[model samples]
Target: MKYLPQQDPQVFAAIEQERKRQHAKIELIASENFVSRAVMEAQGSVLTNKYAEGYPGRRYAGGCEYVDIVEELARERAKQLFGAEHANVQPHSGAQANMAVYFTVLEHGDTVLGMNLSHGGHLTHGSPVNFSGVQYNFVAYGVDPETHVIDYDDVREKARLHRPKLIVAAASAYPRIIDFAKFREIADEVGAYLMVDMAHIAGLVAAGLHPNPVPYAHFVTTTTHKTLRGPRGGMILCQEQFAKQIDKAIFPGIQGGPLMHVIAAKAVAFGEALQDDFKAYAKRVVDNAKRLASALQNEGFTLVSGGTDNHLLLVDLRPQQLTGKTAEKVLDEVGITVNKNTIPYDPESPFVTSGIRIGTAAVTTRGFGLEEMDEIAAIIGLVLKNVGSEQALEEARQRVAALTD
Candidate 1:
């Protein structure tokens, strides 16, 4: 039966308003995307009503024949997409994926080397406040003080000193493509396994816009949302050797029932990504990002690592006399959406960050290109220039409405 509230006109009117908000706003959050209607349809399908407790054929209950097919299809697509030996589509989130990897490979109190949280790395990598830090010993590597780039020399030095069990090689806000082979070398040197968390660049990697970490890293984890344009879910990729451990870690070790609907949606997304046009779309995402970053640079905004090599760029707001938090609020008032992010060696706290990270994934999904990016850069520039002018915000709103209409 349809949800009575969902069928209400007032409820639908609110959805329309939100749709306008999304379309009218310049959504630049690096970890977000506008999914296709087909994916959404799959997510909202009757599959959600099913209770699939385990992997395909080994489920505890019956009535899973179709679910078995759906899961196997998702697994095959993921392996084909990344050329990995194993794929697990059961993880609920990227954090869970990381936790599963750690639980599967390392024991409590074991040492791990990860990128520093304030230096463009994810919280799951090794933030002291996170579970990864509380349960395990975490040594962090940071960016170069001068170049604002990951100091691999320092990373190797730290690896040599500590010899961590696992070395996480990925970033949430990194603007450059990571050298996965270098990470593999470091891990091998230290007798550690390299686990690449490609959550931020899954679609880009799938489209050949980013480096393929599958070969070099022992295991990989990623989110299905963001650049992947799938339902919000997590997936694991690894060699056949770790397959059983990974599955066990995700099931009784991590979660209970799998969201069959989301799995179906993920399968659909992977299928869509295998098409010829997805590569074209992903390339456009990168091109639009480069254009936006260049335009912002021309407008006096300092981009982290000089510029981007993928779908996202980090903008240091210090030169513009704007705090990242304030910029986020003001942009929202003008129908643009973004998140405040901490820069490498950030002077401010995460709540009042020094940087704002932007991505082209959502805008590109909306069928925008470099021409649109130039205009968006102008809008962001105007907001920064006229700090508190309602007139300026409204002007941007007008332009946003025009673009959507």
Candidate 2:
């Protein structure tokens, strides 16, 4: 960072400070992870200077020979990793990738069925304020009132009634496995196309730890970051029949000038994920999540769905008479980072939600195992169970320092 430090001291210091913060804290956020240094280097490479406005061998711009190689490598590796017939490696972000799918298959005002946002669905999954809801008519399906998990019967009932043109089967905070096969059944009965946003669990899917949505869904979209540990970008995988259509939807309909550098980094990350070590890493991620969930449960924390089946758990803080907002703040002060989230059928407003979502992916990437997760849960229990006491907070902070150091 010679030029960066000399020319931009302010930005340089902020970057350094962020590095220090990351090294000094435990990250339990469900949607965050640390990319490998190789991925970082690829993202910072000279490929960023190129303008590859189209797919390989078909670009509108000149001098795209090398960028073409990078994009092709990314697309092919993605297809191989997920067993998809075709892959589009350039949607900028998951939302845009989803948008391209919508643009390709549905017209404005077309009816769609999606998961309820407050019930674990992402914003692009037809939130009222997002383009998805305003541009398309969306009917929502949520979890069962008792189980607090998706009710396939309810989904089928809704599908039969709405007869949507598309059905989005995905979640941002769901802990258990998503049954893409069940969703496919629903979509088939309703004559609707099924699209899955597996951004949160791409790595697990790659490692065969989670069910692969690619074979069942008509379209599968994901972010390259999160569990994938890649540069921040998006990808779309579809059947060979929709290859040209999906490509055009992303290139001319939604985005232009692919980020060749990020694509290169994504390629590198995909290669890493294909290795035996990444499969081991992914398994440990789930193991750590289960361990942490058990530890938190032993501490009397009520986890949503009783517990987790994947890399994250949603903790309902009402058991301790604490709000998610307060817990987030208290935990942050003690060098433990997590985000406030909403529980299914949450009685509070989204702003003052009743839960916090915790995951093991980031910590697992940092080489944390079951014992570390046990210690983390203990720290959370100590701090939250003793909320409103500065002395307890300080003590928790000291314990956190010892662990981080």
Candidate 3:
């Protein structure tokens, strides 16, 4: 902001609005969280001016002595946080991290098994439009219709039938905890490598609230921004034997010119997670999410898988005679932001699904607790149940203002 305001008024104006918008709106998007000021400062530091490519101690670019130390810090802290034998902290995004793993292990058009996209799997997890799906022969396993949890039997059946080389576990919007042990067992039975996308539950796993996947998974990938509460970046964790291949895949295989500033920020975030306080923070994230889920359920919203064991939940909007699109817009009108999402066995198309995904990470970061969560659910109930009522909308707006204020 120091020189940006004077050098570029147009861009600065939007940045100003963005800062205020973040403070004013309730960010319920499951994938979003507010990073610490220290993390932001690290990203804006002089490290951004550097061009450090390749791994530490053997860089393609010159003058990487200090940058090497920074990268080492990031790598070491990541390894410690996840208890992984090795860590590659240079992936630019979660998608690229997945790409690097596929590039290192699987051949093009290789058979792969992942969770169904409509059942909480990410687009990077074998959506046909993505490179992973386009290049690989990707098949999908879905959740049970009644319980809305991953059908492990189906996973084993699919793996056995397809003879896949890789089996992916974990999800983007799933409320229940993933059983990495079972996934690993299935992969072992089928002679496949197990990969866990712990992007959504990294913080919970770090805080010891959820089961760690590193012990069972051959490869693990995550985004730094979500639950981990770092800058917007990605990382790959694997055993010591695969470290060299993972690092090479990230450097020369898919991406070029690592972002030193973001790596610095990742190091800072990892440093924070190492402390005792971050554990408490992660606990509150899940506590607040469960509180929100209960409050939403009390308001007559049907939650997928009944409730949440972590930081996010999916609200099945059909019971309320609404679509995720309608609820998302209504919540946005009342200054609450959430994304429409597809639930298991969604009857509608992707453009207008029957569910909305919500999370408490950002609001909990803003100091909202259980009481505030209950109030938020009530406000949402009023807004959605009475969408055509002007008085109800105005009242909901006032309630939202009070909460954000």
Displacement of the residue 213 alpha carbon in candidate 2, Å: 0.6
Badly placed stretches (over 4 Å) of model 2 are none
Model 3, span 1-405: residue lDDT tens: 689999999999999999999999989998999999999999999998898888899999789999999999999999899999999999999999999999999999999999999999989889999998999999999899999999999999999999999999988999999999999999999999999999999988988999999999999999999999999999999999999999999978999999999999999999999999989999999999999999998999899999999999999999888999998998888899999999899999988999999998889889999999999999999998999998999999999999998
lDDT of each: 0.91, 0.92, 0.94
- Candidate ordering by TM-score (highest first): 3, 2, 1
C-alpha lDDT of candidate 2 relative to the true structure: 0.92
Measured by lDDT, the strongest candidate is 3
TM-scores, all candidates, are: 0.96, 0.99, 0.99
Summarize candidate 2's per-residue lDDT along 1-405 as a digit string, tens digits: 678999999999999999999989999999999999999999999998988887899999888888888888998899889999999999899989999999999999999999988889998988789999999999999998767899999899999998899999989999999899999999999899999999999999999999999989999999999988898989999999999999999988898788899999999999999899999999999999999999999999999898888898999998788888999999999999999999999988889899999999999998999999899999999999988889988988988887778
lDDT of 3: 0.94
RMSD of 2: 0.8
State model 1's lDDT.
0.91
Ranking by lDDT: 3, 2, 1
Q: Alpha carbon lDDT of residue 304, candidate 2?
A: 88
Total colliding residue pairs, candidate 2: 0
